[PDB]
Paper text:
In the [name] protease, for example, AAA+ [name] ring hexamers bind target proteins, unfold them, and translocate the unfolded polypeptide through an axial channel and into the peptidase chamber of [name], which consists of two heptameric rings (Wang et al., 1997; Grimaud et al., 1998; Ortega et al., 2000; Ortega et al., 2002; Sauer and Baker, 2011). [name] subunits consist of a family specific N-terminal domain, which is dispensable for degradation of ssrA-tagged proteins, and large and small AAA+ domains, which contain sequence motifs that mediate ATP binding and hydrolysis, [name] binding, and substrate recognition (Baker and Sauer, 2012). These structures show how asymmetric hexameric rings of [name] dock with symmetric heptameric rings of [name] and reveal how the pore-1, pore-2 and RKH loops of [name] function in substrate binding.
As single-particle data processing with C2 symmetry produced maps with conformational heterogeneity, we used signal-subtraction methods to allow independent classification and refinement of [name]∆N or [name] density. The structure of the [name]∆N hexamers in the class-1, class-3, and class-4 EM structures were very similar to each other (pair-wise Cα RMSDs 1.2–1.9 Å). The hexamer in the class-2 structure was generally similar (pair-wise Cα RMSDs 2.6 Å) but differed in the position of the 'seam', a dilated inter-subunit interface that occurs as a result of ring closure. This seam was located between subunits A and B in the class-2 structure and between subunits F and A in the class-1, class-3, and class-4 structures. In this regard, we note that the pore-1 loop of subunit-A contacts substrate in our class-4 structure, with these contacts buttressed by interactions with nearby RKH loops.
Residue numbers in the entry:
A (entry chain D): 62 to 226, 233 to 414
B (entry chain C): 63 to 414
The structure:
Amino acid sequence: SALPTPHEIRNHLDDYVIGQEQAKKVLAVAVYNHYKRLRNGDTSNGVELGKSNILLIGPTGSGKTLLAETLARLLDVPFTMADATTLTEAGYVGEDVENIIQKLLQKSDYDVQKAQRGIVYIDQIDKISRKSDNPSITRDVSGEGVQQALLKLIEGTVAAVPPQGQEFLQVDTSKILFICGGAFAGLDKVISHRVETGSGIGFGATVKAKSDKASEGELLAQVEPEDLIKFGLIPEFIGRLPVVATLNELSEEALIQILKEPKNALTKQYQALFNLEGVDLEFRDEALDAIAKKAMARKTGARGLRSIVEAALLDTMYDLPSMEDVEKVVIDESVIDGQSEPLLIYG
Amino acid sequence: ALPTPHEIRNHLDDYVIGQEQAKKVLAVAVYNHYKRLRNGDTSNGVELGKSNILLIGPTGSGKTLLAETLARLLDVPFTMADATTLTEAGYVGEDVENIIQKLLQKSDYDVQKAQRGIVYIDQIDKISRKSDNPSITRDVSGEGVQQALLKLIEGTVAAVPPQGGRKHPQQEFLQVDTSKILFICGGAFAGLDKVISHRVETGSGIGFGATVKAKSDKASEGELLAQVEPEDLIKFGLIPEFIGRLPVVATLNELSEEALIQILKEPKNALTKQYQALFNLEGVDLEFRDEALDAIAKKAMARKTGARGLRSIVEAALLDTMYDLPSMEDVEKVVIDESVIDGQSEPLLIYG
Ligand SMILES: Nc1ncnc2c1ncn2[C@@H]1O[C@H](COP(=O)(O)OP(=O)(O)OP(O)(O)=S)[C@@H](O)[C@H]1O
Ligand SMILES: Nc1ncnc2c1ncn2[C@@H]1O[C@H](COP(=O)(O)OP(=O)(O)OP(O)(O)=S)[C@@H](O)[C@H]1O
């Protein structure tokens, strides 16, 4: 009963994700090492084995949420996908932190011994951060307060969970892994202050003003915990998440592979959408390069790609069901620009 | 015979390093708790007092670790609760009495054995009153929790449903005294250094006569917390009536460059021993030369996160090696060099 390896688990995520080689290594080692700590019954010399959570950081639509979703498929141990926006500071009307553990049991069928060895993922983590409110004039119930509650959850404790909705079940969390990730906004500006040192207003001071500092791919790599403190996160919270994963923006070359290599790509989606209708679909390489340039200008990422395709094919889809004897559709580069219309084959 | 402070401290030293004054406070309390417990109103003196503990220190200093290691050697029951999940006597979050309920689970519902137990609370700063908040409001999380704990630290009796009850039929509760129960509250306070500076330095004068700050780095956190007093905590948000219940105070100094080196080798549960055991099952050995450990100390202190921010320095380095180590075969030992920590070199692998 040999366990999988990082090279093996990386091959699975590579089929669904592209151009995130640095981040996939982190999830592979954590998942790999998670089975090792579970394999040991706390009997070896290395008693009280340490834990190492993960903090995923990337631009918008870079594929953070997709990694955690595809991971749960091949994962044997349970998995959940919660959100931090709905949390509150232990007593307000929104929600409690313990609800995350409740969702985990639904996947494990209320198996405590099986749920303790599970994995947890959190999305939209940047929402819980002091918005330039370090003095803390008032208490943030949806922000700072949430981080304070999660502090003990990442270390390990026991939390009451109503089974099935006057007793409660205790579920340890010292061995549970957490993968928190949320695209941070404005983080590039704070990191620039530490490394720019280029105000240059006086005579002696030097003003670079080359506009090259705004390189997200190269700027996030230089991140550190101190940079997050100025953002709003508490140091106590970051210490619970030692590992950090930085994701690069999507380049023009990477976007082309997203439409062909992944099985769940949009090209294969529409290909099957028309397959049921008895019509073939095609996408030439000349059209893919033009779509990549149009998406990067939108500053939205992979998620802002459907707007380029659906808008281009909206007119064709409207009149396609009424049309008969059409077996194939070809989309040229001019169609995206709007100069020409898609070519339809009859037969 | 009962344990001794030197013996109980020698045990904690195996799991904790670089905290001399903090270990002394816990030893005297535990050593004195058995005395008050052994002779309850069975001596010439009567009305034996009590002295709780208030642990204060930076992040990753070892506050939560002392409570865990203490439970291993402690005979009487012990628990590890939290203050973030508490509400003010009626709201939806939680009641203060849940702390006593958790104590009975470990004591097997032994009321006589539960009153003689010890209690620990973590993250006490999270219930600190916001000094200047809107007057028309109610701080159920921060002010209410302190108000509720007042009678608890002093001594009272609280209703506790035993086992939760089978149904409405029972509708009874058990009384559990708390006058003899010890409480060890602790939590990293944020912004406390700024409060002591205003009271101690009393400068920040732009004028000529006023003395301006000599350097940017001043008022060392370790040396600044030592000058703490109860009046400082009042400006933080705590109520004097609550702090009066916790007379003893312990100031934990931040980590030192030499202390971090000892934490990886002297303790039994050190990270080096953890990773060594991680590869021991894999049939692979490991090495960590002192030339690399001292270099890691500079990287950790730069983060200003504490000992808990050390895994980021190690796992970020060994991420590449662990990724391809299982696929590789005929490898028996691994060597770690100083350059690898810097990132300019690749760790050497010993074939076999
Ligand atoms: N590498 C990728 N390969 C293929 N599709 C991708 C990739 N990255 C993103 N996508 C697409 O983008 C969609 C959403 O990606 P997400 O994982 O949500 O990105 P994100 O960083 O999580 O954005 P946020 O943080 O949720 S606003 C996916 O369902 C895919 O359709
Ligand atoms: N003196 C020490 N010796 C060895 N390891 C230590 C020491 N102090 C801290 N550590 C390490 O730091 C980890 C956590 O320390 P903690 O006691 O949780 O710090 P902390 O101040 O309690 O964190 P808070 O209270 O949530 S801000 C331990 O599991 C150890 O790995």
